[PDB]
Amino acid sequence: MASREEIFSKVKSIISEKLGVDESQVTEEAKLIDDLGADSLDLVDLVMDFESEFGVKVDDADLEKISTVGDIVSYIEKKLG
User: Fold this and answer.
1) In this structure, which of 9, 54, 62, 80 has its CB flanked by the most CB atoms within 10 Å?
2) 34 is catalytic
3) Mapping DSSP to helix (H, G, I), strand (E, B) and coil, where does residue 2 land?
4) Contact of 26 with 57, CB cutoff 8 Å
5) 22, 34, 35, 39: which one is catalytic?
6) What residue stretches are annotated with the Carrier domain?
7) What are the two backbone dihedrals, phi and then psi, of residue 3, each rounded to the nearest 5 degrees?
8) d(CA 19, CA 71)
9) Residue in 25, 75, 16 with CA at minimum distance from that of residue 51
10) Domain range annotation of the chain
């Protein structure tokens, strides 16, 4: 079943494994590009990984609305319903 823990944990799994960074750098208010150093290319791959992982499609506009991990987490929780 859907759960916030599932979102955050899975989200960290993609970002952490591809960047080699611990969730300490990951924050609901931390920016993936500034706080972690993941540029637009990095961001596309990370969100994409969630796109297939959660079996959901994302809006290019949603990407613009998503900057921090908080947005990533909140996005999946609401997008799935």
Assistant:
1) 54
2) no
3) coil
4) no
5) 39
6) 5-80
7) -160, 145
8) 19
9) 75
10) 1-81
Look at residues 44, 39, 41 and name the one whose alpha carbon lies nearest to residue 58. Answer: 44
Q: Cβ atoms within 10 A of the Cβ of 2, count?
A: 11
d(CA 38, CA 4): 23
Positive or negative CA dihedral for 50, 46, 21, 77? Answer: negative
> What would the DSSP string read from start to end of 35-66?
TS---HHHHHHHHHHHHHHTT----HHHHHH-
Give the residue carrying structure tokens 């969100």: 47
Q: What is the CA radius of gyration of the chain?
A: 11
In the block, tokens 């613009």 appear at 64
CB 44 within 8 Å of CB 24: no
The strand pairing partners of 31, in sequence order, are: 68
The answer to whether 17 touches 78, Cβ cutoff 8 Å, is no
DSSP state of 29: T
